[PDB]
Amino acid sequence: GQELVSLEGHQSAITALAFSKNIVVSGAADGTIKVWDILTGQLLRDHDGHQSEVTALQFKDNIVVSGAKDGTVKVWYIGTGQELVSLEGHQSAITALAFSKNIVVSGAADGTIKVWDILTGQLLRDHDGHQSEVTALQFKDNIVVSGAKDGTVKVWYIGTGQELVSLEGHQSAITALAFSKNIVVSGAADGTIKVWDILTGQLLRDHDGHQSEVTALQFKDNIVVSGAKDGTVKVWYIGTGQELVSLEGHQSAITALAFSKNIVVSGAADGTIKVWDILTGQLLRDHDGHQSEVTALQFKDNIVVSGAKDGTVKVWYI
């Protein structure tokens, strides 16, 4: 349970983080984007980003999709950092990104949602998504599910361009989403978690949650992991709302969550990173990760990658 590598990090707060293969892409509030090789810990690509704060990152098959505060959306190659396609982006700040096959879906602070083809650069769909800032976005199988700061959740089809079903949403800002072919599950800031039949729109379950002011959510299978400002990390079943295991949490506000296999990695505003086993509830690791708030966590193949508000990027083993 030590550090794999030292990484130089950035000169400003880490705002986005992506992890794939042995490559980590990190974005900072000064617009700089850096690419690192985990095996050697060397910075391969420097200054490939934007001129405003990086707000979202997507990394899939040697291609990085990055969004910035000025609304720009860039698609470039990790090998050379040269942009592949030119996207006009949004006029408002990018707030959410989804990347699947050749499609990029971007959400902005004005509520707009745009669908791009990263082979032609064409704007496939221009959407007046919500009357509020798009705070979450999930893309799967030709259908987009979005969440906004006003509590609204929406799903639509890319070709038709109209909504498939009307979901009532929440009454606080949405935090994280996920959905299957049959159901949608969404969670808001006040702890609410709701599941929706996509066809009819019916509310199959309405859970009030166990926390006040959640700051991070993570869905996988029917298990939700929720962190809150009070420092609690809770694991429970979305079908019934029953808590599964008890975790000590942190003495500081939860600011990042990662979830892989049966391992939960949580980061707090004091920089501490904790590693839990949801089968037993025991604390596997208790790292004094960073000296500032943990702003991003990536967890793949027993390797945790973390970023902090001081610009540091660390990578760990379990």
Numbering used by the authors: 1 to 318
Show me the paper's own sentences about this structure.
WD40 proteins are a subfamily of propeller proteins with no intrinsic enzymatic activity, but their stable, modular architecture and versatile surface have allowed evolution to adapt them to many vital roles. A different computational approach was employed to redesign Tako8 to create Ika8, a fourfold-symmetrical protein in which neighbouring blades carry compensating charges. Tako and Ika are the first successfully designed eight-bladed WD40-repeat proteins for which structures have been confirmed crystallographically.
The concentration of negatively charged residues reflects their high conservation in the parental template structures, so Ika8 was designed as a fourfold-symmetrical protein, allowing the search algorithm to identify compensating interactions between adjacent blades. Ika8 produced two crystal forms in space group P63, with one or three copies in the asymmetric unit. In all crystal forms, the Ika proteins assemble as trimers which stack on top of each other into pillars. Unlike in the Tako8 protein, the conserved inter­actions stabilizing the crystal assembly involve hydrogen bonds between the outer rims of neighbouring molecules, while the interactions at the top face are mediated by water molecules and are not conserved. In comparison, only the alternating repeats of the Ika proteins can be superposed, in contrast to the template structure where the overlap of the individual blades is much poorer. The symmetry is also visible in the electrostatic potential map, where eightfold and fourfold symmetry can be observed for Tako8 and Ika8, respectively, with the exception of small differences owing to crystal-packing inter­actions; such charge symmetry is absent from the template protein. The melting/denaturation curves show that the Ika proteins are more stable than Tako8, especially under low-salt conditions.
